């Protein structure tokens, strides 16, 4: 009993902006995180090895992560 109306400013637009920001961040954040996990698990990182004699590497063969090499 005795419930009073609480006058507050319109909180609809601020919540709408926060929901839109979260949705549009996550829309590419979730696939990128999933793809990074799948790159790390299945492709994996490179292993340091000495250069074979007479062989010159490409300029992208000096990096460890697959994404950095790409």
């Amino acid at each position: 009993g005795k419930r009073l109306f609480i006058i507050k400013p319109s909180g609809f637009y601020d919540k709408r902006f926060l929901k839109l920001l979260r949705f549009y961040i996550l829309l590419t954040g979730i696939p990128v995180v999933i793809g990074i996990t799948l790159i790390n698990v299945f492709i994996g990182e490179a292993e340091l090895a000495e250069i074979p004699e007479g062989y010159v590497p490409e300029h992208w063969e000096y990096f460890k992560h697959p994404i950095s090499r790409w």
Partner: protein, 37 residues
Amino acid sequence: SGYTPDEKLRLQQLRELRRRWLKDQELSPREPVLPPR
């Protein structure tokens, strides 16, 4: 001394309007009408 009769009349009318406004701030039993979540 106390209020003038005009001050008394204005205070009475303002108090009546204030009490009506404060009564109108109460909530109906059906409010708030929550949407089906």
